[PDB]
Design goal:
This is part of a larger assembly, with 3 copies of chain A and 1 copy of chain B. Chain A is of the alpha+beta class. Chain A contains 5 helices and 20 strands. In chain A, the strands form 5 sheets. A 5-stranded antiparallel sheet of chain A has the order 1-3-7-5-6, with no helix packed on it. A 5-stranded mixed sheet of chain A has the order 16-15-14-18-19. In chain A, a hairpin with a 3-residue loop joins strand 12 and strand 13. The two termini of chain A are about 30 Å apart. By secondary structure, chain B is mainly alpha-helical. Chain B is about 45% helix and about 10% strand. Chain B contains 4 helices and 2 strands, in the order H-H-E-E-H-H. A two-stranded antiparallel sheet of chain B has the order 1-2. In chain B, strand 1 and strand 2 form a beta hairpin. Classes of the chains: A alpha+beta, B mainly alpha. At the C-D interface, loops of C face strand 20 of D. The complex binds copper (II) ion (3 copies).
Chain lengths: ~400, ~100, ~400, ~400
C-alpha cells in the first residue's frame, strides 16, 4: 500500500507492469488463486536503484493472509533470487492459498537488492472461512505428509521450555541458598568464601555434568528421528527467459518505436501533455490505446470502448488522444498525447515536482484494426507548469 | 629518524633488486626477469591478479612513482613510530596488579 | 590434489574441462612437455564464485617440479590475468620443463579472482635426471643469456650478508662497551650520562656517515651494471578469443541442445539418473557418447568401443545409455541417462547432498555415424534418493 | 595542459580522439564558439581505469575563461554523467561563450569515475573585450530573464554579512562587559557567579529569541519571493547512441581490420616501427593515411599532400609509409609502418619505457582513391630498443 509515498520518477522508470490478473477475488480458507502478469524492465535504469541483476518476486500482502504455494518468473520456479535484464520483459505468476478471513489488498511485488521494493498493481481479495481450518500440507522426500501450519512447533517447545525452566530453577536456587543483600555484605566484609565454597562447587560440577549429558542425549535422539537432513538451499537462480511473444518491446520483425520529445505536467494538477515521435514499423495501421506508468492505466476510450476488468484505483479512461488517425504502416509521426485523470494526482505521480529527476517513464500500447497489440517504451524529461 | 627510514628504503634495496628489472621479450611481450621468475617457478596459490603492485593510473605525473612512495612512507612512518614508541613503553610496564 | 574436498556443485557448474592432454608422461630434467586442453565456462555461474572476468591459467603442481616456460589461452600468451566470458569455450596450453626427479601429479588449473582455485584433470608425470643439471636459460633484450635457476642470486647475498654482519657488529659493539646490567644500573641510579656521552656520539656519527656512503656507492654501482631497467609488467590482458570450431556449444549452424528435466542421485551411492530433452538441430543422426563433469568422463561404451587415453582416476565406462537410437536430424527426444560408476563416489561428487545448492552441471557429447562430435551444456536441479 | 605528465600507455589505450574542431580561434567576450569532435572507446580498456560506464564531458580550460552554454555527446544534451561503451564511437560538442580576455589553451576532456581526467586535443583561443561587459543571460520557467554572472549574489551578501556582523557584535559584547583576564581570575578564584548571573542570562534569552525570530521571518520572506523551487537535478543519463556513419570501427558491411604484430620504439627516441596485419574487407583499394594516438596525428604525406588545419603541437607529417600499394579489396597484407616525429618524444609518449604496461593503442585511418576514410583500431605490446 506504500507505493503512493515512493518517489514518482522511480516508480515510472523501473518496472513497467502489464497484464496483471487475479484468478479470483474471493476465496475460501484453503482455496488456491493465482496472481499473474508481465513486467518490463525500463531501458534507462535509474542510478538510485542498483542494477536488478539480483531481484525477488513477491506477493505484496499484509503478512501471510494468503500462503504463497509457488511462484514463477522468466519461465522458472522462483523461490530464490533471480536476474532481470534491463530492457527485457518477463512473465510471472504466484499461486496464493487463502489463510486469514478478511478483505486484503494483494500486490505484485519485486525487490531489487541494490534498491528495495517496487510495488505492482494490487487488488482486494476477500477470504472466507476460519483460520482454524487452514492447513497446508507438504510432501517430504521420504513420501510422508506434514502440515506446515503446525509441523515442528511441538518439538521446539519441548526443547525450549524445559531449558528455560532449568535456567530459572538455577537462578532461584542461588538466590535462595544465599541472599542478594547477604552475599553482598559477606563479599564486602571480607568473606566471600562464606558465599561459595565447595560443595557449592560440587553442585555446579554436577549440574554441568547433567547439562552436557542432556545435550549429548538430545542431540543423538534428534539424530535418530531425522537421520537425513540437508543445508538450507540458497543462491541466485540461472538466467531467466524473457517474453518473446510477439510483441513486446524490441522483439520480432514488426514493432512501434516511440521517442518522447517534450512534455509538460501541471503543478498542482491532474494533467500531462507529451509529444511522441512514433514510427511503425509494423505492416498495420495503429491507433494508440493505452499508456501504463506505475501500474496505472490510462486508456484511449476510442480504442477501449469496453473497458477492462482491472482495479478501480488504477484504471483511467482519459489516456486520450490520437486523432484516431492510425499512422502507418511505415509512417513516422509526431503526435501530441494528453494524459488527464484524478488518479495521476491521487497516486502522487504529480509529486514528480518534488523529485530529484523530473522525468517520465512507461509503456505505450498501440492497437491494430483487429486485436493485435504492439507495445513501445516511452520516457524522458518532462517540465512542470506552475499553475495557481 | 622515521623520515630517513622511509626515504632510504628503496635505495638500500635497489642493489638487490636491479638485476631482476632487466628487460626480456617472451612471446611478443615485454617482461622483467622478476615477472618471469615468478612465472617460471610455479606457485599453486599465486595468481598474477592477486599481486597488489602498481598497475598505473591517470594521476601519475612522471616518472615520480618511487619518490612519492618513499616520502609517503616517510611521513606515515612518523605517526606509526610515535604510536609504537609509546607501546614499547607500555610493554616495558613493571606494574604489579593484585588479582585475576 | 585438493579437488575431492571442494564442494561438488561448484566443481560441476564452473569450468567444464575437455580434451585435456599431456604431450609426455615421462621426461628428463630440461626436457619440455605440453599440457593442453579446452575449457567451457558454464552458463549459470554460481553466486558463490565471482564472475571469471579476472582469472589466471596455471599448472596445478606441487612447487616447481616442472618449470612453466609459457602458457596460452584464448589464443593469447597468458603470463598475466585474463577474462573468461560466461558461456564461451577457450583452449589453453602450458609448456612445462622437467626440473625435479620424481613422480608428480600435474593438473590444469584456473583461478578466479572472486572465488579461488578450480582444478582441472591431472596426470602423473615421471621426471628423470638430477636437479643439479637443470638450467633455463633465458635471453635478455641486449642479447645475452642468463640461467634463471642461478641468475642474480650471488648479487643478493653479496648485498644482504655484509649488512647483516654490519648490523650484528653494531649490536655487539654496544653490548660489550657497556653492559646490559651495568647500563641498567647506571641509568636507574641517575647517570645515564655515564652510559652515553660523545664521543659515543662521534662513533655513531661516523658509522652513519659510512652507512649513507656505502648506500650511495652501492646504488651508483648497481646503476652502472644494469643501466636500463623496466618496472614489473602487470595488468589484465585484452579480451580472449573463444573456440569457434565447430562445434562447440552455441556455435555454428548445426548443434544439439539439452535441457535437464528431473534427476535423481543415490545417497549414499554411485548412481545418477537424468532425463534429458534433446534437440538436434544438426543434419545428422546422433548418439550420446560422453558426459563430462569435474574433469570426470562418463563414457557410453556403445560409442567408445575403444576407449581413450586418459587418467585412470577420472575415466569411467558407464555413462550409459541411449538406446543407440540416434535421435534426429530435426528430432526432439526426451531420453533417460543413467550415470553409474565408483568414481562418482570417489571424487566425492556424491557429497552434493552436503552442498547448499543440489544441482548438476557439465557437457554432453553427441556423436554422428562418422567422427563428428557435438557438445551441449547440461545442468539443473537434481534430487537425492536416501537409500539404506 | 597536464597531459604530458600522464602515463603514455593509458593515454593511447583509453579514448582515441578524432575530428576535433574549434568553431573559431578568436572570439569577443559574449561571442559563442563550438568545440566538437569524435572519440573512440578503446576495445581493451586498461585495469587501472574504471570502466567508463560513468563519465563526464568537459571543456579542458583554466577556469571559466569561456562559459559553457551547452554540450552534447552520444546525441544527447550532457549536463550530467553519461555511459560510454567499450568499443564504440561517440561524437560530442560543447558550446563555449567568451568571458575573459587573453590567450587560453582549450581542450576536449572526458573524466571517467573510476579513473580520472582524459585530455583531448586543445587549441589556443584568443578572447577580446573586457570581462565587465560579459553577461549570460538565462530564461527561468516563469519566463523572466536573469544574468547568471551576477544573479543572486546580492541576496547572499544581504543574508551573510548581517549575520557575521551579529556574530562579531556578541563576541565583542561579552569580551567587553567581562574581561578575558578578569573573567579567568574570577572563575579561578571561586566565583564564577560574578562573571555570569541572570540578567546576563536575560540578555542571552533575548538575543536567542531575536535570532529565532529573524530566522523564521527571513525564511517566510524568501519563501514568498521564490515560492516554486526544485531540488538539484542529478543522476546518470540514459544510454548514449554511438556513431554509425559509415565506417567507423566495426560498423557497416565494409571495413578494415588491423592486428598489431610486433613493435619497436627507441629509448631514448623519436621512432616507432610496427608491423600490421591488414584485412580489407572493403570493396575499395586502401592506402594508410593516418595514425592517431593521444590526440597526436601522424600523417602519410602521400595521402595528406595537403595537410590539415589542426594544432601545431599535435600535427605530425611522418606517419609514413605504406608503399602506396593500396592493398585490396579482399586482400590481407602485413605491412611495416614507421612512425617518426619529434612530437612522439615531446608529448612524452617515449616515456612508455617508464610504464608498467609496454603497450601501444589507437586508430589507423585508411583512405580510398576518392575521399572515403575507413578507421581501424590498432594496439598491443611493443618492445623498446635501448639506444645510446
Ligand atoms: Cu495496496
Ligand atoms: Cu592431483
Ligand atoms: Cu592545453
Amino acid at each position: 500500500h506504500g507505493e503512493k509515498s515512493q518517489q514518482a520518477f522511480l516508480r515510472m522508470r523501473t518496472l513497467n507492469w502489464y497484464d496483471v490478473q487475479w484468478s479470483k477475488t474471493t476465496v475460501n480458507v484453503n482455496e488456491e488463486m493465482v496472481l499473474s502478469g508481465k513486467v518490463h524492465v525500463f531501458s534507462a535504469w535509474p542510478q538510485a536503484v542498483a542494477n536488478p541483476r539480483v531481484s525477488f518476486l513477491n506477493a505484496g500482502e499484509p503478512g501471510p493472509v494468503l500462503v504463497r504455494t509457488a511462484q514463477f518468473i522468466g519461465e522458472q520456479f522462483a523461490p530464490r533470487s533471480v536476474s532481470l535484464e534491463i530492457g527485457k520483459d518477463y512473465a510471472f505468476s504466484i499461486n496464493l492459498r487463502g489463510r486469514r478471513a478478511g478483505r486484503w489488498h494483494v500486490h505484485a511485488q519485486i525487490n531489487v537488492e541494490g534498491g528495495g521494493p517496487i510495488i505492482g498493481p494490487g487488488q482486494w481479495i476477500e477470504i472466507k472461512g476460519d483460520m482454524k481450518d487452514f492447513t497446508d500440507p507438504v510432501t517430504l522426500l521420504d513420501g510422508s505428509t506434514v502440515d506446515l501450519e503446525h509441523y515442528g512447533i511441538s518439538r521446539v517447545y519441548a526443547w525450549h521450555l524445559p531449558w528455560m525452566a532449568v535456567g530459572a530453577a538455577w537462578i532461584f536456587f542461588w538466590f535462595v541458598r544465599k541472599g542478594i543483600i547477604t552475599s553482598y555484605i559477606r563479599v564486602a566484609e571480607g568473606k566471600a568464601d562464606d558465599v561459595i565454597g565447595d560443595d557449592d562447587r560440587r553442585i555446579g560440577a554436577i549440574v554441568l555434568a547433567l547439562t552436557i549429558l542432556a545435550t549429548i542425549v538430545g542431540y543423538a535422539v534428534t539424530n535418530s528421528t531425522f537421520p537425513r537432513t540437508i543445508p538450507l538451499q540458497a543462491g541466485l537462480q540461472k538466467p531467466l527467459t524473457p517474453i518473446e511473444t510477439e510483441g513486446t518491446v524490441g522483439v520480432g520483425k514488426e514493432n512501434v518505436t516511440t521517442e518522447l520529445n517534450g512534455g509538460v505536467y501541471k503543478v498542482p494538477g491532474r494533467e500531462l501533455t507529451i509529444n511522441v515521435k512514433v514510427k511503425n514499423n509494423t505492416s498495420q495501421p495503429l491507433r494508440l490505446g493505452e499508456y501504463t506508468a506505475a501500474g496505472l492505466r490510462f486508456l484511449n476510450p476510442d480504442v477501449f470502448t469496453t473497458k477492462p476488468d482491472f482495479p478501480d484505483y488504477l484504471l483511467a479512461d482519459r489516456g486520450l488522444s490520437v486523432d484516431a488517425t492510425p499512422i502507418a504502416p511505415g509512417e513516422a509521426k509526431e503526435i501530441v498525447v494528453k494524459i488527464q485523470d484524478a488518479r495521476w494526482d491521487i497516486e502522487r505521480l504529480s509529486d514528480l515536482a518534488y523529485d530529484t529527476d523530473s522525468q517520465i517513464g512507461g509503456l505505450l500500447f498501440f492497437f491494430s484494426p483487429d486485436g493485435k497489440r504492439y507495445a513501445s517504451e516511452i520516457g524522458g524529461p518532462v517540465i512542470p507548469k506552475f499553475v495557481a | 629518524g622515521s623520515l630517513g627510514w622511509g626515504l632510504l628504503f628503496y635505495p638500500n634495496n635497489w642493489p638487490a633488486i636491479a638485476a631482476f628489472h632487466q628487460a626480456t621479450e617472451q612471446h611478443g611481450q615485454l617482461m622483467t626477469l622478476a615477472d618471469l621468475i615468478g612465472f617460471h617457478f610455479v606457485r599453486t596459490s599465486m595468481p598474477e591478479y592477486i599481486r597488489m603492485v602498481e598497475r598505473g593510473t591517470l594521476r601519475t605525473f612522471g616518472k615520480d612513482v618511487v619518490p612519492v612512495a618513499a616520502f609517503f612512507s616517510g611521513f606515515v612512518s612518523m605517526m606509526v613510530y610515535f604510536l609504537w614508541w609509546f607501546m614499547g613503553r607500555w610493554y616495558s610496564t613493571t606494574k604489579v596488579i593484585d588479582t585475576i
